[PDB]
Design a protein around this nucleic acid. Structure first.
Lengths: 517, 100, 249, 735
RNA sequence: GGCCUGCU
RNA sequence: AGUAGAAACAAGGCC
């Protein structure tokens, strides 16, 4: 026989005497009071005595209640993407190799030799904050070293570049302040905290809207070459395969898929180079392989990326690189969209047109950008945007097919009778077929993955709340709110400078205007 | 449970106007049947078929329990029996519209 | 012979001798889990980051005497630099594939006998017969169902003694199993796995998985049988039902 | 025409397309530097929500503590932590009355568990704040260090192997004049009574990363090892209690949560007749943890443990007693930059008490000025309220008491309410004959909540008619609707190993098909994309391609060597045979009949130097931290192949003064491996006893040599050699 | 210039 | 410069 003894004594007892309500002196007395306590209507007394200003009055939510979300005002919003999306240009070879098949440098050189009309590069639009001559010299250095590879025996799989002052400045080398001890730096007046304040305010511009518009447009190529799956054995598997083939036919010829492949390849190459060649600057040509309507496979070279020192320890540590991309879009028409870019004139292009032949200029967008391990990892998983979008569409199809006891995919994709509101024109709201909805959702997911930021998450949550409230209103469910101004202030604090979140807020305002009728 | 009675059909001039109304005992549709064919979609409540868009307007009064079809700038090709329909299945007997 | 010999070698050095002397059996687990390695918060990010390095995986020292240091072209397969807090050495992923093309071979005939659950799943599916897909709204209602289709009507602790007596007959201690169902299970799984040399721990784990009953709460519509729940993803959907009959029936 | 996805909601209801409103395809927000600012802000906010309380100075720790309990009743809708003892005791009494026998039973099972629990249960935990080194370390490491220090100081009751005895030693340590700790730079340092008290009552603060759904970052806390046993016992009691409450939803999963929500909504609306109106409030509680006073949890537990053995009451009361005096470490510190001299500096947080305020901005300057009075030995007293959901289950109990307090038997009015509470979130279905009744009911519910220190977030809450609501990212619209955007981040390679990643990916696809209503074609697309990413991550391509990688040569020779190439695993560059019908089968078993016997034997060879198994717990369990939720573990079906290797470790310990920890790790692992070879059941069932290693090992050597001669390889020569070698190690242990 | 580490 | 956003990266430490 034995009795378990867990005795509170010593210091730990005194602590127990100091963890009681205000008017108790010992744990013994408080436990005695608790044991002797019985309910005698004490909540009612304090409820009656409590001030009546403590209330949760319900404010009715009507059509005239919700006001449009206010957008921040300031300098126009700039471009944040790691590569050109709407203004990209492609140099091609028409080779039979597959996406991963081949060697990067040789393919890039072969694609670039396919173009004739090179001119000595010159400044067109300066960075406005950097040293454009450094960008010019970097471009000429890249060309020279590309030729140097072309001369020798076998094209190396991966090339390292020289660490000249040009790319030392462009890649931000030896600029991190040296780490020292506080006891040695205390009398320095300039010594203070890191700048920690709300980001700069910027107003929305019309370029992001057009970029999204053309990100949902069809193309003359198939930008997805899917892998293999076990041969379908069940009828449900056949239905799934037919649905999947329909969606692939709809979305493969879409600029969103091209952006997905571009981002995946670029981030994969950048991460692998950073993990392998941590010290030495590395050249990586932007490569993407597609298939033409005729069926011939083709390669495309958008430009080059120079990765710098990438001794990345934390998931937030930044690897800086410099990106160069060919384009034909003149930067003199929307300068505010290219605040952080330096754009040169590098050649002239001749594309067959009925107006003689255009002989357009051909510029080089050069900029210094940066990423991190987390950003690289998440940008190399951009293919789940396809999932998100097509899961939404398949949920739509299944929900509609639960009504009519039959699979409804084929008529949705061919007859195109039913349409959903997927945009507004000055005439009014415009509806498109299911395929256009697929492409629109895919583009939305791709832009979410490209312009991701805390602002996007906060706005998404605090605007989903208001969207649910508005949906309840439209469903005739007598919605009510306790503090709608607080919710509005919570939504409006997420809109600071991100083009994507500001465009989403403008879309939400338009949806409110069209809704509530 | 849902009975439907259409009103407002008749003989009309080409380029004329006509207000159909369907009284009932839910979403509503207007459909038409020409003498040589099966059912043709006209409107639902809003959406309008290509052959009738901009010419015709569908509306409803949920307090009167009535759906209306306001037809304008009528063509000889609108000549049909116009049927009202209710869904969660319920079809009216149809009202004759003859345009000439 | 060997075992007591490395025991004596350990006791030769003062630090390990002190660890062996002062540490009691109960603390076994604690010191065994004593490690400086934090549990990873973002495994995917680092797996995608480590695989870009040379020598990203770890293997026992014995690899240095079964696999050559380099392959035909000279790509290194393993390194002699040990891991952070272990005697294992860091090696390249090629040393895996190499082991699958010229490494030692054995008789894997008994793996089907060990991994009974998975092979039973494969056999059940191979002989299944599908049917037409019917499209109609499915009223998925949430219910508690048993997922394991081979549970022998035993709980975790109830079958743990059976598993020990099957694998570790000497560490059973006081317990001698009374239920005769447990007697027959012990006899069968003893004579069946009498010389299997996969590992005692994996054998025990798979016996626990096979015999112990496990239950989970899932949205189901129809079925409700153990064999019909493992394929619940293939037979029931949002607006479609796929008639299926596993090979067992 | 301008494309606008949001307009899609004009035809598709919001909940039927809510997945579009979840941007879970991009990088989630991360914190970059110190979390000291957030810690100070949280401390100040917790202290100013209870400003009208009464101040005292603890005689043991000497820290200022603020007690708001029984303070003035709130006169505004702002958050308030002035909980009333009598009101909460009455709420618990009504909870008991509506559920007779709940507390007595739960206390009985908790007493059983506490008196049969072992010390090793504390090792099954994530990072904990080791006070021996003043830093976060794995639970097992911190427990071992604390046990070593206790044994060195003379507290050896934990040698009984009982968690209750470990807690007895922990409390006895509180009354010691001078303890001793070890530091490496080894130096023995002496800690007086007060310093050790503060080191045992302190919490370590960090910044929470990968938190999706808010613009601002938050701070979280991790307690020490002295207080985790009491927390374990208290949470065991709270879980046993909540398991008996149908209004709670914290100790269950997601599907159970949905089922209970559907049941409660149907019960509330169906029982309501045509005359009664029904309204659902989708409520979130603002500053949930900052307004929950540990003293009130002490009151709740001492009411729960009435008419129970006094030792049980004491052991369950120790935890809130320590939380009421809890201290919080400010954090990593602050980093300064000087651009004129082009340098950077890192000052630890412990200097915030004395460091001048010229380096700090206005906001941080004011935060430091406000928090300085509470700074004691580099840590701030945080008595008023909990820091980060340590008592989740007790908070859920309080919320369930509030929910049950409106069962129409205590309301004494036509209106009534019910619903479901899961800490920091709730759904409240209130019925009343008229809109005035609903308004009165919600007002009284809010008022009663304010009497218990619980606040309702008016900005994140809204009320509509029943039939449509939200609860923890679950949107109910006449039936729960799948989202699939919460599980999107889990569709990639998990990062465990090749076989584990393959099995986890296929199993995740299967589960999201079963639960989150993932479509067949979408599932096939997910399988294809996952296979592509898997091959591109592990450098294991189909083998018939010309994609040159660091692993494409060996894979290609294995491909050309194999005859039946359809049996090769995707990890070895083989075709993928997976499909919707094969998502529940491991890859090895699906390709078993197609593999060549040579490759099959080479693959699944027990003697492979790659496979390593430590314990029964870590055989086929993978810890995947889900997005928008706490860390979770999953059982994944996999066959132990040569691909089941474990990845490289950090290896950065070599540059730190804590370098001897690796030598101790190696020696401990060598001893553990020797013991396992001596005691094969060491892993599956953790050995128990009070003897020492060498005794068991030598004695079992004796016996096993004996019997393995009585039949086996041993010989008299070898048996006698072993016997006298055992004697040799015996005399060695003597000296 | 030479060598060490990349969640400690 | 750049990334990024309530604090950081733009390699660290050891000789």
């Amino acid at each position: 026989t034995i009795e378990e003894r867990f005795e509170i004594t010593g210091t730990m007892r005194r602590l127990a005497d100091q963890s009681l309500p205000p008017n108790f002196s010992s744990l013994e007395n408080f436990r005695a009071y608790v044991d002797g306590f019985e309910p005698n209507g004490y909540i009612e007394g304090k409820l009656s005595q409590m001030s009546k200003e403590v209330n949760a009055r319900i404010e009715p939510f009507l059509k005239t209640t919700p006001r449009p979300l206010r957008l921040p005002d300031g300098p126009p919003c700039s471009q944040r993407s790691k590569f050109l999306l709407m203004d990209a240009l492609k140099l091609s070879i028409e080779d039979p190799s597959h996406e991963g098949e081949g060697i990067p440098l040789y393919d890039a050189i072969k694609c670039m030799r396919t173009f004739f009309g090179w001119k000595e590069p010159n400044v067109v639009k300066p960075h406005e904050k950097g040293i454009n001559p450094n960008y010019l010299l970097a471009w000429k250095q890249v060309l020279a070293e590309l030729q140097d590879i072309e001369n020798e025996e076998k094209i190396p799989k991966t090339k390292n570049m020289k660490k000249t002052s040009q790319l030392k400045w462009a890649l931000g080398e030896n600029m991190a302040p040296e780490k020292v001890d506080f006891d040695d730096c205390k009398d320095v007046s300039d010594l203070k905290q890191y700048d920690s304040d709300e980001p700069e305010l910027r107003s929305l511009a019309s370029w992001i809207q057009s970029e999204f518009n053309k990100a949902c447009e069809l193309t003359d190529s198939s930008w997805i070459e899917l892998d293999e799956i076990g041969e379908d054995v069940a009828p449900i598997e056949h239905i799934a395969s037919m649905r999947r083939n329909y969606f692939t036919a709809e979305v493969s010829h879409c600029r969103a898929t091209e952006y997905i492949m571009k981002g995946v390849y670029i981030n994969t190459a950048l991460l692998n180079a950073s993990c392998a060649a941590m010290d030495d600057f590395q050249l990586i040509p932007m490569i993407s392989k597609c298939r033409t309507k005729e069926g011939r496979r083709k390669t495309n070279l958008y430009g080059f990326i120079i990765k710098g020192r990438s001794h990345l320890r934390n998931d937030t540590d930044v690897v800086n690189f410099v990106s160069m991309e060919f384009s034909l879009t003149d930067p003199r028409l929307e300068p505010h969209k290219w605040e952080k870019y330096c754009v040169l004139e590098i050649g002239d292009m001749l594309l067959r047109s009925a107006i003689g032949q255009v002989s357009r200029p051909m510029f080089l967008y050069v900029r210094t950008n940066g990423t991190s391990k987390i950003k690289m990892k998440w940008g190399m998983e951009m293919r789940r945007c396809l999932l998100q979008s097509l899961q939404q569409i398949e949920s739509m199809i299944e929900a509609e097919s639960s009504v009519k006891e039959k699979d409804m995919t084929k008529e949705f994709f061919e007859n195109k009778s039913e349409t959903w509101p997927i945009g507004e024109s000055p005439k009014g709201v415009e509806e498109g077929s299911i395929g256009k909805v697929c492409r629109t959702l895919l583009a939305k997911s791709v832009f979410n993955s490209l312009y991701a930021s805390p602002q996007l998450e906060g706005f998404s949550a605090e605007s989903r709340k208001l969207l649910l409230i508005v949906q309840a209103l439209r469903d005739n469910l007598e919605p009510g709110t306790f503090d709608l101004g607080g919710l509005y202030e919570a939504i409006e604090e997420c809109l600071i400078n991100d083009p994507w979140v500001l465009l989403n807020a403008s879309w939400f305002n338009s949806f409110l205007t069209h809704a509530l009728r | 449970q849902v009975q439907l009675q259409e009103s407002g059909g008749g003989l009309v001039q080409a380029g004329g106007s006509l207000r159909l109304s369907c009284a009932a005992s839910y979403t509503m549709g207007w459909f038409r049947q020409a003498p040589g064919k099966e059912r043709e979609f006209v409107t639902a409540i809003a959406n309008y078929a290509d052959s009738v868009k901009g010419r015709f307007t569908i509306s409803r009064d949920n307090a009167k329990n009535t759906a209306y079809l306001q037809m304008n700038s009528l063509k000889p090709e609108d000549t049909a029996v116009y049927y009202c329909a209710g869904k969660t299945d319920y079809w009216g007997q149809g009202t004759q519209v003859t345009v000439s | 012979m060997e075992r007591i010999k490395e025991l004596r070698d350990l006791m030769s050095q003062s630090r390990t001798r002190e660890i062996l002397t002062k540490t009691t059996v109960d603390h076994m687990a604690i010191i065994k889990k004593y490690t400086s390695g934090r549990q990873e918060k973002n495994p995917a990010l680092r797996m995608k980051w480590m695989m870009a390095m040379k020598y990203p995986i770890t293997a026992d020292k014995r690899i240095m005497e079964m696999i050559p240091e380099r392959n035909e072209q000279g790509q290194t397969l393993w390194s002699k630099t040990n891991d952070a807090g272990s005697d294992r050495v860091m090696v390249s992923p090629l040393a895996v594939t190499w082991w699958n093309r010229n490494g030692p071979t054995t008789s894997a005939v008994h793996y089907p006998k060990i991994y009974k659950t998975y092979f039973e799943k494969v056999e059940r599916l191979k002989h299944g017969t599908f049917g037409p897909v019917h499209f109609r709204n499915q009223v998925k209602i949430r219910r508690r169902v048993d997922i394991n289709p081979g549970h022998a009507d035993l709980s975790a602790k109830e079958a743990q003694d059976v598993i020990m007596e099957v694998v570790f007959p000497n560490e059973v201690g006081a317990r001698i199993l009374t239920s005769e169902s447990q007697l027959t299970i012990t006899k069968e799984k003893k004579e069946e796995l009498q010389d299997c040399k996969i590992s005692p721990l994996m054998v025990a784990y798979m016996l626990e998985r096979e015999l112990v009953r496990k239950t989970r709460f899932l949205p189901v519509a129809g079925g409700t049988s153990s064999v019909y729940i493992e394929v619940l993803h293939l037979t029931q959907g949002t607006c479609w039902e796929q008639m299926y009959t596993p090979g067992g029936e | 025409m301008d494309v606008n996805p949001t307009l899609l909601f004009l035809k598709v209801p919001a909940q039927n397309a809510i997945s579009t409103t979840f941007p879970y395809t991009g990088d989630p927000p991360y914190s970059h530097g110190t979390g000291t600012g957030y810690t100070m802000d949280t401390v100040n906010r917790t202290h100013q929500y209870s400003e009208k309380g009464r101040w005292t100075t603890n005689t043991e720790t000497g820290a200022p503590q603020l007690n708001p309990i029984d303070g003035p009743l709130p006169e505004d809708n702002e958050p308030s932590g002035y909980a009333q003892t009598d009101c909460v005791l009455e709420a618990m009494a009504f909870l008991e009355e509506s559920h007779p026998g709940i507390f007595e039973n739960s206390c009985l099972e908790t007493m059983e568990v506490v008196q049969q629990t072992r010390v090793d249960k504390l090792t099954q935990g994530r990072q904990t704040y080791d006070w021996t080194l003043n830093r976060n370390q794995p639970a097992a490491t911190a427990l071992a260090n604390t046990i070593e220090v206790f044994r060195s100081n003379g507290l050896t009751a934990n040698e009984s192997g009982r968690l209750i005895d470990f807690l007895k030693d922990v409390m006895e340590s509180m009354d010691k004049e001078e303890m001793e700790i070890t530091t490496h730079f080894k130096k023995k340092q002496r800690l007086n009574k007060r310093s050790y008290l503060i080191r045992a009552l302190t919490l370590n603060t960090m910044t929470k990363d990968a938190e999706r759904g808010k613009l601002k970052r938050r701070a979280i806390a991790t307690p020490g090892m002295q207080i985790r046993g009491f927390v374990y016992f208290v949470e065991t009691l709270a879980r046993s209690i909540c398991e008996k409450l149908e209004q709670s939803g914290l100790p269950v999963g997601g599907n159970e949560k949905k089922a209970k929500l559907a049941n409660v909504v149907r019960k509330m609306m169906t029982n309501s007749q045509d005359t009664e109106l029904s309204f659902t409030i989708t409520g979130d509680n603002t500053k949930w943890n900052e307004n929950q006073n540990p003293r009130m949890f002490l009151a709740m537990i001492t009411y729960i443990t009435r008419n129970q053995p006094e030792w049980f009451r004491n052991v369950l009361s120790i935890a809130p007693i320590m939380f009421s005096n809890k201290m919080a470490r400010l954090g990593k510190g602050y980093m300064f930059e000087s651009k004129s001299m082009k340098l950077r500096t890192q000052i630890p947080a412990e200097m915030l008490a004395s460091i001048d305020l010229k380096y700090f901005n206005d906001s941080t300057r004011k935060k430091i000025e406000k928090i300085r009075p509470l700074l004691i030995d580099g840590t701030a007293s945080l008595s008023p309220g909990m820091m980060m959901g340590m008592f989740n289950m007790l908070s859920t109990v309080l919320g369930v008491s509030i929910l049950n307090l409106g069962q129409k038997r205590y309301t004494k009015t036509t209106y009534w309410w019910d619903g479901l509470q899961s800490s920091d979130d709730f759904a409240l279905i209130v019925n009343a004959p008229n809109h005035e009744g609903i308004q009165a009911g919600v007002d009284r519910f809010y008022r009663t909540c304010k009497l218990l220190g619980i606040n309702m977030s008016k900005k994140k809450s809204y009320i509509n008619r029943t039939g449509t609501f939200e609860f923890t990212s679950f949107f109910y619209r006449y039936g729960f609707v799948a989202n699939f955007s919460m599980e999107l981040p889990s569709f990639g390679v998990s990062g465990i190993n090749e076989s584990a990643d393959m099995s986890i990916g296929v199993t995740v696809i299967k589960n999201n098909m079963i639960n989150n209503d993932l479509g067949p074609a979408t599932a096939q697309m997910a399988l294809q994309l996952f296979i592509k990413d898997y091959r591109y991550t592990y450098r294991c391509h189909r083998g018939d391609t010309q994609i040159q990688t660091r692993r494409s040569f060996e894979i290609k020779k294995l491909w050309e060597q194999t005859r039946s190439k359809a049996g090769l695993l995707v990890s070895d560059g083989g075709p993928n045979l997976y499909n919707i019908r094969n998502l529940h089968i491991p890859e090895v078993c699906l390709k078993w009949e197609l593999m060549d016997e040579d490759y099959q034997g080479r693959l699944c060879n027990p003697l492979n130097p790659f496979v390593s198994h430590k314990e029964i717990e870590s055989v086929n369990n993978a810890v995947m931290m889900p997005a928008h939720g706490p860390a979770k573990n999953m059982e994944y079906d996999a066959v132990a192949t040569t691909h089941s290797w474990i990845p490289k470790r950090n290896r950065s310990i070599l540059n730190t003064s804590q370098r001897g920890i690796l030598e101790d790790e190696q020696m401990y692992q060598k001893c553990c491996n020797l013991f396992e070879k001596f005691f094969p059941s060491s892993s599956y069932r953790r050995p128990v006893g009070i003897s020492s290693m060498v005794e068991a090992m030598v004695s079992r050597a004796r016996i096993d040599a004996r019997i393995d001669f009585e039949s086996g390889r041993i010989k008299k020569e070898e048996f006698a050699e072993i016997m006298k070698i055992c004697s040799t190690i015996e005399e060695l242990r003597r000296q």
